[PDB]
Design a protein around this motif. Structure first.
Motif, PDB file in Angstrom:
ATOM      1  N   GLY A   1       0.819  -1.134  -0.030  1.00 41.38           N
ATOM      2  CA  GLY A   1       0.221   0.059  -0.100  1.00 41.38           C
ATOM      3  C   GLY A   1       0.797   1.331  -0.029  1.00 41.38           C
ATOM      4  N   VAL A   2       1.989   1.186   0.442  1.00 46.89           N
ATOM      5  CA  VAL A   2       2.916   2.308   0.629  1.00 46.89           C
ATOM      6  C   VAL A   2       4.221   1.978  -0.413  1.00 46.89           C
ATOM      7  CG1 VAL A   2       2.036   2.838   2.915  1.00 46.89           C
ATOM      8  CG2 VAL A   2       4.187   1.601   2.727  1.00 46.89           C
ATOM      9  N   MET A   3       4.842   3.121  -0.668  1.00 50.42           N
ATOM     10  CA  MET A   3       6.124   2.833  -1.482  1.00 50.42           C
ATOM     11  C   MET A   3       7.237   3.649  -0.688  1.00 50.42           C
ATOM     12  SD  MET A   3       8.594   4.819  -3.230  1.00 50.42           S
ATOM     13  CE  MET A   3       9.414   5.035  -4.772  1.00 50.42           C
ATOM     14  N   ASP A   4       8.201   2.746  -0.540  1.00 49.27           N
ATOM     15  CA  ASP A   4       9.564   3.299   0.520  1.00 49.27           C
ATOM     16  C   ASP A   4      10.643   2.295   0.109  1.00 49.27           C
ATOM     17  OD1 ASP A   4      10.264   4.946   2.233  1.00 49.27           O
ATOM     18  OD2 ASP A   4       8.651   4.747   3.796  1.00 49.27           O
ATOM     19  N   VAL A   5      11.829   2.351   0.914  1.00 47.26           N
ATOM     20  CA  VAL A   5      12.921   1.575   0.877  1.00 47.26           C
ATOM     21  C   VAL A   5      12.501   0.067   0.986  1.00 47.26           C
ATOM     22  CG1 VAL A   5      15.382   1.341   1.359  1.00 47.26           C
ATOM     23  CG2 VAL A   5      14.172   3.511   1.377  1.00 47.26           C
ATOM     24  N   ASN A   6      11.910  -0.229   2.144  1.00 47.17           N
ATOM     25  CA  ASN A   6      11.891  -1.465   2.658  1.00 47.17           C
ATOM     26  C   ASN A   6      11.013  -2.503   1.899  1.00 47.17           C
ATOM     27  OD1 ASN A   6      12.896  -3.284   4.642  1.00 47.17           O
ATOM     28  ND2 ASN A   6      12.497  -1.681   6.426  1.00 47.17           N
ATOM     29  N   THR A   7       9.876  -2.103   1.307  1.00 47.32           N
ATOM     30  CA  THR A   7       9.137  -2.688   0.275  1.00 47.32           C
ATOM     31  C   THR A   7       9.768  -3.260  -0.774  1.00 47.32           C
ATOM     32  OG1 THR A   7       8.537  -0.560  -0.373  1.00 47.32           O
ATOM     33  CG2 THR A   7       6.899  -1.284   0.963  1.00 47.32           C
ATOM     34  N   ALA A   8      10.633  -2.655  -1.408  1.00 47.96           N
ATOM     35  CA  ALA A   8      11.210  -3.377  -2.419  1.00 47.96           C
ATOM     36  C   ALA A   8      12.660  -3.918  -1.802  1.00 47.96           C
ATOM     37  CB  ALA A   8      11.847  -2.249  -3.578  1.00 47.96           C
ATOM     38  N   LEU A   9      13.131  -3.527  -0.721  1.00 48.59           N
ATOM     39  CA  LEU A   9      14.511  -3.869  -0.087  1.00 48.59           C
ATOM     40  C   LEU A   9      14.092  -5.740   0.415  1.00 48.59           C
ATOM     41  CD1 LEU A   9      17.489  -3.355   0.536  1.00 48.59           C
ATOM     42  CD2 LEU A   9      16.531  -2.880   2.649  1.00 48.59           C
ATOM     43  N   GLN A  10      12.950  -5.935   0.887  1.00 48.85           N
ATOM     44  CA  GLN A  10      12.518  -7.190   1.137  1.00 48.85           C
ATOM     45  C   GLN A  10      12.479  -8.100   0.045  1.00 48.85           C
ATOM     46  OE1 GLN A  10      10.072  -4.563   4.191  1.00 48.85           O
ATOM     47  NE2 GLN A  10       8.887  -6.076   2.904  1.00 48.85           N
ATOM     48  N   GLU A  11      11.965  -7.813  -1.091  1.00 48.76           N
ATOM     49  CA  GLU A  11      11.801  -8.461  -2.385  1.00 48.76           C
ATOM     50  C   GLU A  11      13.001  -8.542  -2.940  1.00 48.76           C
ATOM     51  OE1 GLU A  11       7.627  -8.500  -3.496  1.00 48.76           O
ATOM     52  OE2 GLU A  11       8.434  -8.770  -1.645  1.00 48.76           O
ATOM     53  N   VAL A  12      13.967  -7.779  -3.095  1.00 47.07           N
ATOM     54  CA  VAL A  12      15.317  -7.860  -3.742  1.00 47.07           C
ATOM     55  C   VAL A  12      15.925  -8.748  -2.900  1.00 47.07           C
ATOM     56  CG1 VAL A  12      16.459  -5.912  -2.550  1.00 47.07           C
ATOM     57  CG2 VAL A  12      16.743  -6.746  -4.924  1.00 47.07           C
ATOM     58  N   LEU A  13      15.937  -8.847  -1.518  1.00 47.95           N
ATOM     59  CA  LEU A  13      16.879  -9.645  -0.685  1.00 47.95           C
ATOM     60  C   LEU A  13      16.263 -11.022  -0.935  1.00 47.95           C
ATOM     61  CD1 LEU A  13      19.051  -9.741   0.980  1.00 47.95           C
ATOM     62  CD2 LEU A  13      18.073  -9.017   3.100  1.00 47.95           C
ATOM     63  N   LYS A  14      14.906 -11.198  -0.967  1.00 48.31           N
ATOM     64  CA  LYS A  14      14.448 -12.589  -1.294  1.00 48.31           C
ATOM     65  C   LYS A  14      14.813 -13.349  -2.589  1.00 48.31           C
ATOM     66  CE  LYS A  14      11.442 -15.708   0.704  1.00 48.31           C
ATOM     67  NZ  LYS A  14      11.855 -16.786  -0.099  1.00 48.31           N
ATOM     68  N   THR A  15      14.624 -12.395  -3.604  1.00 51.25           N
ATOM     69  CA  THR A  15      15.158 -12.665  -4.694  1.00 51.25           C
ATOM     70  C   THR A  15      16.721 -13.030  -4.768  1.00 51.25           C
ATOM     71  OG1 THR A  15      14.593 -10.445  -5.293  1.00 51.25           O
ATOM     72  CG2 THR A  15      13.451 -11.950  -6.581  1.00 51.25           C
ATOM     73  N   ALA A  16      17.372 -12.397  -4.217  1.00 56.06           N
ATOM     74  CA  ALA A  16      18.774 -12.701  -4.136  1.00 56.06           C
ATOM     75  C   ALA A  16      19.102 -13.892  -3.585  1.00 56.06           C
ATOM     76  CB  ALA A  16      19.821 -11.440  -3.510  1.00 56.06           C
ATOM     77  N   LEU A  17      18.417 -14.163  -2.542  1.00 52.09           N
ATOM     78  CA  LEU A  17      18.418 -15.543  -1.907  1.00 52.09           C
ATOM     79  C   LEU A  17      17.951 -16.529  -2.721  1.00 52.09           C
ATOM     80  CD1 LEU A  17      17.959 -17.947   0.262  1.00 52.09           C
ATOM     81  CD2 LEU A  17      15.830 -16.866   0.720  1.00 52.09           C
ATOM     82  N   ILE A  18      17.175 -16.448  -3.641  1.00 52.36           N
ATOM     83  CA  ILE A  18      16.619 -17.430  -4.524  1.00 52.36           C
ATOM     84  C   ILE A  18      17.541 -17.843  -5.683  1.00 52.36           C
ATOM     85  CG2 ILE A  18      14.835 -17.450  -6.481  1.00 52.36           C
ATOM     86  CD1 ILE A  18      12.626 -17.029  -4.557  1.00 52.36           C
ATOM     87  N   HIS A  19      17.826 -16.735  -6.299  1.00 51.94           N
ATOM     88  CA  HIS A  19      18.739 -16.787  -7.349  1.00 51.94           C
ATOM     89  C   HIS A  19      20.339 -17.002  -6.838  1.00 51.94           C
ATOM     90  CE1 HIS A  19      16.505 -16.346 -11.036  1.00 51.94           C
ATOM     91  NE2 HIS A  19      15.561 -15.284 -10.393  1.00 51.94           N
ATOM     92  N   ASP A  20      20.361 -18.079  -6.061  1.00 49.22           N
ATOM     93  CA  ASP A  20      21.834 -18.215  -5.635  1.00 49.22           C
ATOM     94  C   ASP A  20      22.786 -17.114  -5.267  1.00 49.22           C
ATOM     95  OD1 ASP A  20      23.493 -20.228  -4.206  1.00 49.22           O
ATOM     96  OD2 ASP A  20      24.387 -20.835  -6.171  1.00 49.22           O
ATOM     97  N   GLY A  21      23.890 -17.343  -5.994  1.00 45.35           N
ATOM     98  CA  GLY A  21      24.917 -16.208  -5.567  1.00 45.35           C
ATOM     99  C   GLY A  21      25.161 -16.071  -4.226  1.00 45.35           C
ATOM    100  N   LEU A  22      25.337 -14.978  -3.530  1.00 47.20           N
ATOM    101  CA  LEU A  22      25.118 -14.752  -2.069  1.00 47.20           C
ATOM    102  C   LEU A  22      26.696 -14.649  -1.602  1.00 47.20           C
ATOM    103  CD1 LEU A  22      22.119 -16.086  -0.372  1.00 47.20           C
ATOM    104  CD2 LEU A  22      22.468 -13.650  -0.819  1.00 47.20           C
ATOM    105  N   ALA A  23      27.280 -13.551  -1.096  1.00 49.44           N
ATOM    106  CA  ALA A  23      28.718 -13.714  -0.564  1.00 49.44           C
ATOM    107  C   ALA A  23      28.758 -14.366   0.837  1.00 49.44           C
ATOM    108  CB  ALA A  23      29.092 -12.382  -0.465  1.00 49.44           C
ATOM    109  N   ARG A  24      28.639 -15.680   0.763  1.00 52.98           N
ATOM    110  CA  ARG A  24      28.581 -16.143   1.984  1.00 52.98           C
ATOM    111  C   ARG A  24      30.031 -16.682   2.773  1.00 52.98           C
ATOM    112  NH1 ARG A  24      23.399 -19.088   1.036  1.00 52.98           N
ATOM    113  NH2 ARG A  24      23.203 -19.396  -1.321  1.00 52.98           N
ATOM    114  N   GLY A  25      30.184 -16.625   4.063  1.00 55.04           N
ATOM    115  CA  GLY A  25      31.506 -17.034   4.762  1.00 55.04           C
ATOM    116  C   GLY A  25      32.273 -15.668   4.919  1.00 55.04           C
TER     117      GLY A  25
END
Lengths: 121, 74, 55, 101, 97
Positions: free
Chosen positions: A1-25
């Protein structure tokens, strides 16, 4: 309902999790930052250590990345959605990174444009 | 016909777990508390790796696996 | 790592490198003429292949 | 060269001889000189196996046979005629090989 | 098992692009007759295929050292629910009909 940083930040973090990658360790993340491969990296500090904050902010200024102060990363952890396997599971996320193109590569978004323009001005 | 009877040694073993501390204390440090800092690792003159490949430290023959490089004076 | 171990001293006579093309069995292999069947599978398929009993 | 060879191979003799006679008759319908069918020694493939799947009982063996009969006919004609005579709705089993040598 | 997520998405676009396939059970051997030279390690591709066809929701049939597959629509529904790829992008397999 609102547009802000978090609304897209959550989605982008979840998609980064989904499409592997991720700087782990402990490795492959500082090395990646020093290689300048990526152009975005989110860091947090909810404990008592100003030295790490100073070091990472010095590195960010060295790479000309403006630190964005986000409060209540628990809000991100509770709004992103953390279903994982089965009915249980809540893997918290503190470090945010997205390889090859900051926003994503499977989609085109104007959030990247508005973020870059806010950073530039 | 008997069993293999592999019991005389090591009845039970515990998994090895490297206590890799999450904090940057042993691996790296700044010792300056400033924007510019000094790096505690010798520069790598080889061009067969990347521009940010930083070597670890042992008693000798710094072990990275990709090169097995050793400092020798020929 | 992986190349420090694999392909060091040639195993030039691998019995485990061969299997029956019907049931993937190690033993009773018929490699003559390129059948590459175990003897039981060959006996099952001998008539279809073209081998028939005459003598 | 105009020496073309046709090699006929099959596991049975009835169909191979029928094809040989058919091709000889076809090459003699036209006024063509044809070298008579030449018979290779018909190599025989043997596979001798134990009858049992286990290793039990009297040691009994199967003696399997597969005989390959080879005939080659030599005549002088261009490739179009050979291609036309091949398309005759051939009977199964007789493998035809033509070489311009 | 012991399969990374990049190889997971690789085998998943392979399943998306092919649909109807034939294969043979090969694991240890380093070169492959008909599904090699795919720029991805053979073992992880084949183990991901094992996960695909043996996780417990698409049936198989193992005989004559080869694999023939009927890819049910339950698996397609699972794929669409997970990766959120609609079926409006029809597979190119509907040509020469």
């Amino acid at each position: 309902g609102v547009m802000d940083v978090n609304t897209a930040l959550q989605e982008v973090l979840k998609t980064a999790l989904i499409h592997d990658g991720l700087a782990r360790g402990i490795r492959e993340a500082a090395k990646a930052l020093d290689k300048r491969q990526a152009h975005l990296c989110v860091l947090a500090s909810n404990c008592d250590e100003p030295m790490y904050v100073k070091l990472v902010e010095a590195l960010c200024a060295e790479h000309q990345i403006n630190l964005i102060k986000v409060d209540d990363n628990k809000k991100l952890g509770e709004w992103v959605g953390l279903c994982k396997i089965d009915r249980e599971g809540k893997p918290r996320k503190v470090v945010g990174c997205s390889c090859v193109v900051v926003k994503d590569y499977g989609k085109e978004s104007q959030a990247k444009d508005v973020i870059e323009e806010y950073f530039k001005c | 016909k008997k069993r293999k009877k592999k019991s005389y040694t090591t009845p039970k073993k515990n998994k090895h777990k490297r206590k890799k501390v999450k904090l940057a204390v042993l691996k790296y440090y700044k010792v300056d508390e400033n924007g510019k800092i000094s790096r505690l690792r010798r520069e790598c003159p080889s061009d067969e790796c990347g521009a940010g490949v930083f070597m670890a430290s042992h008693f000798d023959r710094h072990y990275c696996g990709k090169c097995c490089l050793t400092y020798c004076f020929n | 790592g992986h190349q420090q171990l694999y392909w060091s001293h040639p195993r030039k006579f691998g019995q485990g490198s061969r299997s029956c093309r019907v049931c993937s069995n190690r033993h009773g292999l018929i490699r003559k003429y390129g059948l590459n069947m175990c003897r039981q599978c060959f006996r099952q398929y001998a008539k279809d292949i073209g081998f028939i009993k005459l003598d | 060269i105009h020496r073309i060879r046709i090699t006929l191979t099959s596991r049975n003799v009835k169909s191979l001889e029928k094809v040989c006679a058919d091709l000889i008759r076809g090459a003699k319908e036209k006024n063509l000189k044809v070298k008579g069918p030449v018979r290779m020694p018909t190599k025989t493939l043997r596979i001798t196996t134990r009858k049992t799947p286990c290793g039990e009982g009297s040691k009994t063996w199967d003696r399997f046979q597969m005989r390959i009969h080879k005939r080659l006919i030599d005549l002088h004609s261009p490739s179009e005629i050979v291609k036309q005579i091949t398309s005759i709705s051939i009977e199964p089993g007789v493998e035809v090989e033509v070489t311009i040598a | 098992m012991l399969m990374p997520k990049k190889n997971r998405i690789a085998i998943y676009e392979l399943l998306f692009k092919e649909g109807v396939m034939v294969a043979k059970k090969d694991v240890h051997m380093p070169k492959h007759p008909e599904l090699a030279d795919k720029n991805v390690p053979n073992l992880h591709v084949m183990k991901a295929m094992q996960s695909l066809k043996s996780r417990g929701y698409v049936k198989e049939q193992f005989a004559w050292r080869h694999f023939y597959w009927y890819l049910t629509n339950e698996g397609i529904q699972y794929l669409r629910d997970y990766l959120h790829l609609p079926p409006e992008i029809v597979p190119a397999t509907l040509r020469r009909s």
